[PDB]
Structure formats: C-alpha cells, structure tokens
Amino acid sequence: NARVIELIAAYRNRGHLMADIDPLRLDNTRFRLWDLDREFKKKLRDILSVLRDAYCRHVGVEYTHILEPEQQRWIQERVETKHDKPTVAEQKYILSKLNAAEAFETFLQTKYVGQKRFSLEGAETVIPMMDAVIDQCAEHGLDEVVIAMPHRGRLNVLANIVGKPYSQIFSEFDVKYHLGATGTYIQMFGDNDIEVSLTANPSHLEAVDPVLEGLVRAKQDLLDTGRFSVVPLMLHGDAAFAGQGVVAETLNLALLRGYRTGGTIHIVVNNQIGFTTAPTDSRSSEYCTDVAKMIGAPIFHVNGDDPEACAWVARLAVDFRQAFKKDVVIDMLCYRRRGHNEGDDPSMTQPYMYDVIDTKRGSRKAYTEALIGRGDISMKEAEDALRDYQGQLERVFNEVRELEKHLATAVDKAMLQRIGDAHLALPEGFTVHPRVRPVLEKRREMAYEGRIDWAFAELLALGSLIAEGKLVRLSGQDTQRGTFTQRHAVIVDRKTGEEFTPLQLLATNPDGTPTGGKFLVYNSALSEFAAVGFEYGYSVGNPDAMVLWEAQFGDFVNGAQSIIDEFISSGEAKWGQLSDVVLLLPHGHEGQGPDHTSGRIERFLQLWAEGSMTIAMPSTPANYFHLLRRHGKDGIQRPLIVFTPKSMLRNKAAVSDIRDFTESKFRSVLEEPMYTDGEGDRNKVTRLLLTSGKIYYELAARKAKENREDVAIVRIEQLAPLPRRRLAETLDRYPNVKEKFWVQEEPANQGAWPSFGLTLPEILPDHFTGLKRISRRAMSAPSSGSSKVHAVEQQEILDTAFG
Amino acid sequence: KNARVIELIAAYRNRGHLMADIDPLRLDNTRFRLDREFKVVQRKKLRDILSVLRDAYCRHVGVEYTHILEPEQQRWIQERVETKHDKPTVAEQKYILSKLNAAEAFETFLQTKYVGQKRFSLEGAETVIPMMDAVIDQCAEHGLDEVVIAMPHRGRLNVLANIVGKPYSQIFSEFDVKYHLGATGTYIQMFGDNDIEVSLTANPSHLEAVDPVLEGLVRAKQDLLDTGEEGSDNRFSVVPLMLHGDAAFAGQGVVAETLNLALLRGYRTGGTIHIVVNNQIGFTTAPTDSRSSEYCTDVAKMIGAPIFHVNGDDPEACAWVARLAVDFRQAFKKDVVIDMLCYRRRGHNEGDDPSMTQPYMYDVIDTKRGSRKAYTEALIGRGDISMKEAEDALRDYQGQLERVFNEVRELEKHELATAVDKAMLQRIGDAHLALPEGFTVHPRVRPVLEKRREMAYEGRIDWAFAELLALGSLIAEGKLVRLSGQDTQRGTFTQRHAVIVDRKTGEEFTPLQLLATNPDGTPTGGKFLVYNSALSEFAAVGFEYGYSVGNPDAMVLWEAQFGDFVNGAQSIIDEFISSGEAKWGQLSDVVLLLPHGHEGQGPDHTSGRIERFLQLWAEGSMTIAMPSTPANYFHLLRRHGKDGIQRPLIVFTPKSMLRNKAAVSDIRDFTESKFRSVLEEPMYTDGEGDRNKVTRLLLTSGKIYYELAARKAKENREDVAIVRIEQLAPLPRRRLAETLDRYPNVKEKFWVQEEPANQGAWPSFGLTLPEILPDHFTGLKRISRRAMSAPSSGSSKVHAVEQQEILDTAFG
Ligand SMILES: Cc1ncc(C[n+]2c([C@H](C)O)sc(CCOP(=O)(O)OP(=O)(O)O)c2C)c(N)n1
Ligand SMILES: Cc1ncc(C[n+]2c([C@H](C)O)sc(CCOP(=O)(O)OP(=O)(O)O)c2C)c(N)n1
Ligand SMILES: [Ca+2]
C-alpha cells in the first residue's frame, strides 16, 4: 500500500517523460509486483490504467511543481477521471477544421511562390486547437480573445480562426504577415459569439509578447474587468520560446497588480527545430516551455497528430485560466514538413528527422483514418470529409480567382488650487510620513503662490487631464515615489502601509459626480524590454488613455531597444498601427558616470522621420506641463520622447509662475526672460548660443555674472520635428548676430549636434550657415567615469561659450 | 498507517521550504500558519524521522530540489541534507566570526570615512562574505584553478578586500569607476594547503548584463586550460561565481537567456554558483511588485537547478550551503542557486528615508542588530564560546576597524603582411575533400566541396570560401578561432558549410579542423570552434564578447542571422563592446558579422543599422567595415587576427552578393595583396580606363557598387567613376585623399547609398567628410532613399522602384 502511494506520485510527477507526445518518435530510448487484482485505499490494475491514460498517452502533464495545493488538486481531478469520448458531431467538426487548415496550406504552396517559410504543414492541428480555446472562452461568456503570434501559419489563422474573407487576405498580394486584424467568432454548437483580434508584430520573435499583455490590459481596464473578459492567446516557436529573454520578462508580469491580464493561454508550435538548429543546441532543459515553471504555470505537452487530445487540452487550459487567473502553457509537438525556406533541403543539416518526416502523412489523413479504424465514422462519412476538403480547396482557389479579375492647454487657477488642495485632502485617520508632509504642504503653497517646480507641474498636467475625464497610466521603476524622491504620486501611511493617491480625487467633480477620468500609477518590475513593450501595447489598446513609461535613468532604456526600433519609432509607417505612448528619460551630465548621464538623444533623433515621434527636452516646469497637456489633447496618436531632469528638479531658477500655466501655451523655442519680459536689448547681441535643457541655467548664470549683453541664449525645447518657423522668427529678432553656436553637454558624436549640425544649415541656410559646435569631445561612452573630469569639462564648455 | 508517514516525508521534501525560517526579518506573520518504529530499509522511531525532516527542510535552509528530473541528483541532495550533520568546530565558527568581523568593520569604515557610499552598503547582508569565502575555499579543496566573479555594485569593495584579497592601499588609491573595474588575486586556504586564483570581471551599472559575459570569459579560460567541454578532462576547473540582487534576478530577461546556455555544448561552463543577495527590496519596490513567483530565483527551475533559500542571520547554514553548492556543481556540472535572505539596513542612497515607502520593513529593521553581533550572541547561547572569547571577537572587530582607518590614512600621506602562399589556399581547398573514412556527403553539399577545391587552384573565389580561407590560414598559423551564431555551421544563406553532416549517421565533420595539424603531423596550436547558437542575441553577443576578454589571442566571431536582430543585444554593444576599453581599460577583439543589404525582404531583413555603430564610434574604439570583394574581406579578417591590437570589428556582410558572379576574387588578390580601405574600379588600376575623363565621382560602400558599375558599363559612362569606402571607421583619410587626387577633372562628388537619408553612412559622412577633407568634400551631395522611420519599406515592389531611382539619379 506504501509502494502504491510512491507509484501514484511517480506517474503524477514524472509520467510525462514516458508520454507518447512526439508524432515523429525520434527518441527510441524514450520508452525503454503482479498483485494488480488487490484492493488499495480501488484495485491496483484500475489505479495504473487511470495513471497511464491520464499521464502516459498523448498528453504529458507537468503540474506537481505548482505550489498552490488547490491548483494541483483541480488538474488532478480533471485529468484522472474517465473522460467522456467526443460525439461524432464534435469529431466531424474537428476534422472540418483540419480540412480547412490543410486546404489553405495546399493553396498557399500551389498558388504563390516563396510561401514555404510561412508553411504550417506538419502543424495544422494548431487550427482546431486555437478554435477550441476561442470556443471555450465564448462558452465562459468572455468578450474578446486577442492573439499574438510569429509569421508561421498567420494567414491560415486569419482565414480559419479570425474568420477574415479570402478577398481581404489575398488582396493586392509580405506586410500581410505583420498586420493587425479584427473579427467575430460564432460558436458552432453554442449560442455565444466572441471578438477575435490579431495584433501587428515585427520579424523579431517574441518581441510582441509584452505588447499583447499591455494591449489586453488596456481593453480589460476599458471593460472594467479584473472577470478578465479579454484573453491573451500567445503563439510561439520552440527555439524562440526557450532562447528569448523577453519570454521570462513577460511571464514575470503575469500576477503583478499593474500588469496582470488574468492569465495568458500559451501555445508553442513545437516542430522540434529552429531553422537548421536541433533542440539540443537551442536549450539546456528537457522542454522548450521549462521557463513557464518560473511562475508555476501548468504545462501540457500534447501530440500534434492527436487533434482530440489537442482540443481537450485547449478547453482544460481556458478552464484553469478562468479558475485561477494564471498562465497555462500548451506545448504542441509537431513537425515542419518542408524546409525553413526556398533554398533549403533540410536533410543537409537534419538527415534523420527528415527521413522520418518523408514517411509522414498529414494530420488530416491520419485523423480521417483513425476515425475509420475506431468505427467512429462510416466510409460515406470519411468520403464526405474528403469532399469537404476538396470543396474547401476549390473555394479558396475560386474566391481568389474572382478577386484577381476585379487646442488650448492653459487651465484656470482654480484647477491648480484643486490639485494643490488634493495633496492635503487626506483620508480619515491617515498618518503621513513626517518627511512627506512638507512636500504635500509646499504643493498647496505652489498652487496658490507660484514658483511651481518640475515635479508638481507634471502632476498639475496629469491631474488636470483626469479632471477633464482622461485615463492616465503612469509606471516605471519606483515611479510612485520617484527615483529622485520628487513625485509622491502615491503616499504611504506611516502606521498601516495603506496607499493614498492624491490625483485620484480629481476623478470626482466638486458636485460628487465622476469625471470619467482615472489615475493608474504603478511601480514596475526591474524590466525595460517587457515594461516598455507593455506601455506601448497599452496605448494601442486604449488610444484615449494618457500612457507614460518612466526610465529610472534614460541610460537603461537601451534594454528596450527592440521595442523602440520595432514598435514605437516605426509601427505607424509599417503597419498603420498608432501609439500615443510617452517615454520619460531622466537625462543630464552631473558626474554620475556613463550609465547615469544619457538617454541617448542622438539615437532617438536618428530614428526620427517626418511625423513619426515628438522629441523634447523642456527647460521649465510650465513648458513640460503644456507639452504633456498638448500630447494628451491634440487628437493625434504619436509617441512622445521626453528627456527629463535630475538635479534641475531642485534648481530654484527652474520654477514657473501661475500665469505660465493659466495664460500660456507650449513654446517650442524659448528666449531669455530679460528680452520677452525684462529691459534687455536684443540689438546688442553679436553671439548667439543655441541650446537645450539644464545647461541654459549655467549659461544664463555666467552671462549675468559678467553682464554679457553681447551674448543671447536661445533654447530649442522641441528637438523633433524641428520648429523651423518659430526658430527662424526668434533668430530674426537678433539682427547684429555675427556668430552662432550649438552648445551641449553631450560628447560631439552624441546629443543633438550629429543631426542639428547637418539639418539646421540645410532647413534654415540664411540662419545657420557657419553654425559651430561647443560640446564635450567625441567619446565611445556617454560621459567620463570621473566626476572630477566631468566638472573640468562642464567649466570648459561655459568658458568656450563666453571666450 | 505508514501511508501517512510516506506522505509526510514527501510533503517535507516537496514543500518544507514554504515553512522554513529563512527570513531574518520575519515580515510574514501568516507564513507559519511518535515512539513507534516505521520502515524508512531501516527501522526508526517516528519522532526521529520527523526531527531529521524538520532540521533538513524547516530550519534556516529552505531546499527546493524535487523539481529536478534526474533521480540521481534528487538522491544526492536528499542523502546530504537528511543526515545528522556534524556541528562545525569552534575553530571553524571562530573563522566564520572573523570573516563577519572583517566584513562589518569594512562597512562601518566605508560609511564613516567617505560620503556618498550608502548606495554600495552591504549592511544587513555581510553574511555574503563568509558565504563567498566558503565557495572559494570549497573550490580550492576540489583543487580547482580559478573562481571568476561577476556581481553588481553592492558590497564590491568589501569583496575586493575580504574575498579577492586586494590591499587597502590599492582599493582606496586616488579615491566611482573602482566599483566597475576588474581585479585578480590569490585565495590562500586558512585551514588547508591549497590556493586558487580569484578574479572579478568589469561590468556597467546595467544589472545582470554581465551574466553572459562572465560565462564567455570562464569558457575561454577553460578552453585555454584544456578543461571542460573542449578539454581532455571533465573538471571545468574555472568556476563562475555570479552574484545578483533579488529584483534584478527576477525581472531581467538576460538571466533566463544565460541560464539557457548552462548545458549547451558551445556555451557550458560546468555549472555556475549563483548567489542572490535577497534583501527583499529593490530601491523602493516591494517583492510583490517585482515578481509573479514565490521566490526571486524561480527562473532557475527552467534548467532544473537545485535552489537553497538560506537565512542571512545564520552564517553557519550559509557557509554549509555554499560548500554543498560547490560539491553539487562538481558532481553534476550544473548550476546551483543560493538565495540569501537578508535586509538592506540603510536607505537606497543618501537622502532616502526608506520608511517613506516601506514603513513596516524599516520599523522591523531598526530593531535588528547586525549579523556579526547576532552570531557572537548565538554562540554564547549555544555555549560554543565563553564571555571572554565574545569580548575578544569584539576586540578583533575593533582591531580590523582600526587597521583599515590607519592603512588608508598612511596611503593619503604618501599620495605585418596578411597575404598567404598559393599552397596555403590549396591546402584549405583540399581539406574540403579530405573526408573521414566511410563518410557520406549529402548530394547537395558535395558540389560545394569540389567547387572550393577548384576555387583554391583556379580562382574566382567567392565570399563564403574567402571567409574560410582567412579563418583556415589563421588556424594553420596556430590561432584559436571561435565562430558562432544562429545556424552559423551551415550558414543562414546555405553558403558556409563549416560543419558538414553525414547523410546516413548524422556525424559532423569540420574541414577547417584539419588545418590544426601541420603536414608533418604535429599540432599548429590552432583550433576551429564552430557552433550553432541558441535563439538569443543578448546572451550570445555577451558570451562572445566575454570569450574574447577571457582569451585575447583567440579570433572570436559572432554572426547575426540578419544584422536587423543585433538590436536585441543593444545593452552589450553599448555597455561592453563599444565602450569597455575607455571605461575600464578592458580590451576585446570580438568580431560582429551583420548580414546587411536592401533586397526587398522588409525592414527586419535589410539593415544592421550602420548609422548606429558609426554614431557609437570614437577614435580607436572599434573598426567598422563593409567590404565589397571576397579578397578584401579575407584581408580584413587576417589583419584583425594578426594586428596585435585588441579592438572590436563590426562587419556588414552580404546576402545576395554571396552569389553575385561579379563579386569574386583572383588568387593574386589573396597571395600578392593587402586590405584596401579605399577601392577604385579595376579599369583604372588594371585596365585601360582614363581617370582624366571623369567629371562626376560617386563614393559608395557595399553591393550597390556592382549595380553602379553595371550601369556605367551599359551606357559607357567614362565621365563617371565609382570609389568604394571599404573601411567606414576610422575613416581612411590619407588613402581617400590620395585616391581622389588621381581624378583632377571632377566637378561634382556624391555619396551614394541604398539606406534611407537618416540611415547608413550619410548622417556621419555628410558631417565629417567636408570637415576632415575640406579641399575634397566641400559641396558633397547625397544620393539615397528618402528618410524613413523604419530601415526600409515592407514592399519588394517599392524597394525595386527605389533601387532604380538611386541608379537613375547617380547617372542623371
Ligand atoms: C529575435 C529574433 N532573432 C532571430 C530571428 C531570425 N530567425 C528567423 C527569420 C530568419 O527571421 S526564423 C528563426 C528560427 C525560428 O525557430 P522557432 O522558434 O523554432 O520556429 P519555427 O520552427 O516556427 O520557425 C530565426 C532564428 C528572428 N526572427 N527574431
Ligand atoms: C537594467 C537596469 N535597470 C535599472 C537600473 C537602475 N537601478 C539601480 C541604480 C540606480 O542604477 S539600483 C536598482 C535596484 C536594484 O534592486 P536589486 O536587484 O534588488 O538590488 P539591491 O536591493 O541589491 O540594490 C535599479 C532598478 C539598473 N542599474 N539596471
Ligand atoms: Ca496625442
């Protein structure tokens, strides 16, 4: 009886190593008491039969790694029971899905050339599997299923899952393998319907994974679900799932209050190959899905030649996700019938795999034959299924044949005061930390008396948008408090730890009615790639939301370079996909080293093309306030890249008056206040210094010290698109200028000079011919490691500018 | 009856760690909420079985091992953890105490002497010093050669003084970059007669980015010692010791990517010892906002690594677990993870009052005495040391505190031809046909082998063979050549065949490996290491960079599938490759091969982003090239391997140009030439072309030369000359000036490129060329694709119209 308990556990824990999951059976070595009629606390023979049928057939179940005992028991109870065999109607429906999938693959490989790399041949069982996921989500009465996938079988998914007509898919035939889509799934045997959408993606495998999560979360927030009535269905390749780090980063978001989507259904199209590379060179684990153990997700390894087991596992996966709001991974073992592309004979690199693959008949033929052998379908019914295949193959050829034949951002002072007062409108019994208390009181003072600092200006911009009814999502590393202890968007009760969000009071009107707005502010995980991916995705999911991601320091945003390059900077031109995502990048030379100095302005300026992004480096709190309000209210979906301050947050010269918020607008170009408001004479100016950011204050302090009336400092607040007209009109007001200099803190090969030094004399030749540069010398790093070297270099720039 | 006992044993083994007293702060208040003999074959009283299970799984060590698929590994851990362990000797306890004394004294000095050092404080986590000491001592006990450490900034200088053994005079000299520099030392056993080398690798502030770099460096050192995967012995005598933070370990994707390399034939280092300094905080962020798993180390389950969660206030358990981790790694050549639960005594940096965001954690922390005082007190309670001995431990603490204050005070008072012979070419050609007895060549690979023998003897050498001629000749000269990347053995474009596969057995054959043996039969000292990489960019590039640091005499090449995917490794490019030399004095000779070219395959199969590498470049940091001929690529690789200078090389390599019949080279280009940074048209250097007829000069780089040359030939345009810039960085100023001076009647000059106006070489050349050579490039104009937000159009129809528009503009 003790040997039985240890045997039951052996099947539950390790039974999946004996499971018949590989349709190619490449591993020969894989499968290599007599008192069975004795009753145990059920007869041993009946215990072993249940254990073999549940754990050693076409499904390999991995679940004993799960720490929650209720989750282990849930799987156990559903897997260790005598399952009701599918009805002939359900079997015929699965067969019709295989018929449609294989007829689409036959057409693709016959009608067009160069389509072999998109081939789903050897993996057509993923179509009835995805169909069962979506149908089971419809059965749960859910609202939408959003899909992210690589290029393999994407057009088959468009036709047989999303339900896109052939006329739309094969219109002016590629970019079609990277575009988004929307459709409606209607249940076959049920009375429910569900929305099905496919998100756009680059060729960069797995990069879309966090983008899907953000998009689904934005949709869930709009529907007020999380319920979690919007389901992410994420498809993968076996080599990419095990090798791409973004997979682990996206899994790590699955249960976070700021990023959870109530569980993702993962489908790995495990064709046991990655171009020419064997699994043994692609991963250090038994399974390509072993990374999912990181969050204790249940994993089901299923034989891709058994579409009934695949459909059953898909439905069980949806039920688990609904019950525990956690990720489920389906590892579908299949094969890639043809080579990776046109110039590939896969027996050059994988002779053994492809000698076995050459003897394989399709999943459709195998399933049709297995249904005859089992006596589930008659010869007429098998013949009718073959008619259905031919008819489906004819329809796509025929339908395609017919296709071929044919605003003010200023707020009222009462708005500033309301946001100010909100910082003191504390809940009953709330204990503020003694060091947070002066920050709340100073904000009430600033709101009524002026000298508004950068940190408060940001909250005035965000707070006024929430008051106007906008959803504001703000996140990043330690973003609630702020890296530089300046934000305090969330304050923590000194005795209970209860969080209080002052800006959330602006979601309610003075009369007590909701504005429709909301403030969602989170501390992110220590991720850049997945967090930026998520935020980009969130802005796509809800175009009406104000979405801001904040880097700890701009220097760490290179960890999210694939998102910047493949989605943010180029998604609009490539896919017509629009994003209003904001990236806040703390930037500035202060002597803290090459990883706490630059958000790499030069790289964002290099990526920029007409109307793709807005790139700014504001120097005043009011200009930042108007930049965020213009972004949220301009009705245009364009990413905004902001180079934000660090020490300039506390510079007492970098403060703004209430009138700058109430009676002004965003200024792309800024002159010195002595010329616009003071008694300064523009006609005395012979040298013009053009700059951006905090170095203005150091240049202005030096000018004041030596009383240099012959020098003027002009700031370019909007770096991209270049404010050509505002720039020209500003410089025209200084007629006696004999020399012009672009002054920057960044090395010569960095900052704005590489692009401005080439663009400014071309766009404005009567103004910038002969433009010279004052900067740090060109460097292989964003700065020196020494704060002593930094300090000498900073002084050398100021001395050169006034020499 | 005994079924409730078998179920109890399994429950403690599987889930005991969930009840183990691992948190020294005890923040979770919900966490912790007989005399009959049983068969276990041995007969033990139920009380004795339960006491063994409680001590093993529910004390100060939480053991996670039942997830391991190998039964022998599960049994090994079980046998060592479920035994009545011999308590450490008073001498061993006093030695652990002396390590805590030294660690805490270093920390107290660091906060008192200098300002702005709070962010690198190890207070609340000093137990990592006797833990690291036990790792290194246990590696010395196994007679290993070296322990190579990678870590973030927290406790770095303490590790330098108390682990690496660097003197204070060296540590606080010209006192920051010191928290990022590499170091080397010798660890000498206290209680033994063994010694071991201890080194610390350089790293940026980018947490976890150094993880694959450490692996690459260790692997290079193992290959040099002929230990491990490419060695005669299975000792893997160089041990990676990788330190982490709890928030970074769970959130950074490079962790999973590096763990995925642990057992790969091309990347394994025989197991890494991981130490997570789990201070249960990440700046102001709580674990519940940093991970979706019970533990920060749950990612390590991915490779079935054993995980030990240990209480940082128990340095005995920490030392014991460290020694067990080294023994497991030696027995199974697999990763071990130590999750050391501790706390961060101070705020994250100066000014930070941590009770603002974590009031509860920091009210508990304020009541906590140090790990040192805790261990001194716990030894008194156990009766292991007397009151006098406890007072001497406090005097050893004061003496250590005085020594560092005094030592630093005293410090302040005092302060080649690349051409080969035709016989070399022929030998590499013949090697492609020198097949092992019984080997079956796939019928489609056989002509490639026969064509390479014909190329070596008769010329018209293509790009793919030229690469193997450079690599093969270096191996023949005694150089180690490491080449890897996605499908690099065969080649993405089916052009390489560095490894060929037996049609019947699947056995691999490497033709270039025959060149590691001289014609007499003696070894050359060279070797060819060629691998297919995992589907990773960040970890694979990190690894290859690290490998070139570990063996500066090796030729290390990493090949991107397409240059477009190298942005996945941007942190390595930015933080190590382009800038490691200027920041840390750390040198790398790593080569990046990036398939590049506009051919209508879309924005992710077109560009390796030349403009970004050119933007990163600064005098003497990297070499950036886009060769147009096979012989020039051959001489570029040979120059790089033989220059005696450690500097990264970035090569933009071809795709369709691999099979362009005009892009072939003669034997004389390999045997009687050198690398040419600037190339003229052969009609001027070898033909009957007249340079004086030229009025328009087109400056270009790469495959567009052939299209421009074909158009010139078609219209017989004697008035137009095409000059190629093969070396993009550093700009070949002298060669470029001398070349253009040979065309006196030139009235207009154009930089012609395939890439959009905001991409390619134009953003830097358009600004630098008129400045570096004003008498030659004043008035230089651009012919290119329009500026774009992506590297190209998604349409091959649009690409084709744009390609023709460039050629027509160049000859209009
Ligand atoms: C991040 C990134 N790095 C590399 C590539 C290049 N790349 C591809 C092409 C050439 O673009 S396909 C491919 C192998 C895919 O292996 P898998 O996951 O087993 O799938 P499959 O069997 O369904 O194909 C790679 C490696 C990429 N797309 N993205
Ligand atoms: C990749 C990347 N993204 C962000 C940062 C910024 N950054 C740091 C500074 C300000 O640069 S420290 C830090 C928190 C570290 O948390 P941990 O791992 O729990 O450790 P600890 O408790 O031992 O400190 C972060 C998040 C970084 N360095 N690298
Ligand atoms: Ca907008």
Ligand SMILES: [Ca+2]
């Ligand atoms: Ca070199």
Ligand SMILES: [Mg+2]
């Ligand atoms: Mg695959």
Ligand SMILES: [Mg+2]
């Ligand atoms: Mg930490």
